[PDB]
Design a protein around this ligand. Structure first.
Ligand SMILES: CO[C@H]1O[C@H](CO)[C@@H](O)[C@H](O)[C@@H]1O
Ligand SMILES: CO[C@H]1O[C@H](CO)[C@@H](O)[C@H](O)[C@@H]1O
Ligand SMILES: [Ca+2]
Ligand SMILES: [Ca+2]
Ligand SMILES: [Ca+2]
Ligand SMILES: [Ca+2]
Ligand SMILES: [Cl-]
Lengths: 111, 112
């Protein structure tokens, strides 16, 4: 896997469109090593290709596969506000669930 | 090593540049036959390369204004037809053609 980060922030829908444009997908860390690689390419909080949109508290990648490795920040995922179904990788490498409508950088993944 | 990825949609050069730069990459510029073939592997149709003779006609440079060495022009190219062809695309046979920068083609981005 190759990981590339965007320079501008955008909502999840636009983030997916960007990675898909070059035939990749939004980065989904499968272990601690990939998590670090993605963190390093991201210069700020960035979207990961994980959501619990289909079923609340059931986090899966953009292809519907349930995720095994997780690296949630203490207190997360909390689904606050009116709901948070998308996921971002914080600058310390931990994860936070956020509104998919909010704007963040995006790290795309390619094979 | 360099990694090459092709776009799904067609767009003019300036948009092609913006797309590759969005992920901090550049428009693919083959420096030898091996790279030219690697770009061929990912491009399913005619695609832009990061080369232009915008500064001086018939003097080809990469997008950073660095004059290129390796070229793989299709027979009869570059011909600067009509109002002018200052951008370059990789044909489906691996050879190159100069085309109008305002015309739309797929784009192959390069990363390292
Ligand atoms: O509110 C914000 O902060 C809390 C943690 O303090 C997060 O859970 C939430 O997603 C927002 O980022
Ligand atoms: C007629 O113009 C088109 O075809 C010629 C070759 O026939 C190319 O040189 C040119 O860039 C266009 O693609
Ligand atoms: Ca949720
Ligand atoms: Ca949260
Ligand atoms: Ca020309
Ligand atoms: Ca031509
Ligand atoms: Cl949401």
């Amino acid at each position: 896997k190759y990981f590339m980060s965007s320079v501008r922030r955008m909502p999840l829908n636009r983030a997916k469109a960007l990675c898909s444009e070059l035939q990749g997908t939004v980065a989904t860390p499968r272990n601690a090593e990939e998590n670090r690689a993605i963190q390093n390419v991201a210069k700020d909080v960035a979207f990961l290709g994980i959501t619990d949109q289909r079923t609340e508290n059931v986090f899966e990648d953009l292809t519907g596969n349930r995720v095994r490795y997780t690296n949630w920040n203490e207190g997360e995922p909390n689904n606050v506000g009116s709901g948070e179904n998308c996921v971002v990788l914080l600058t310390n490498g931990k994860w936070n669930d956020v509104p998919c409508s909010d704007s963040f950088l995006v790290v795309c993944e390619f094979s």
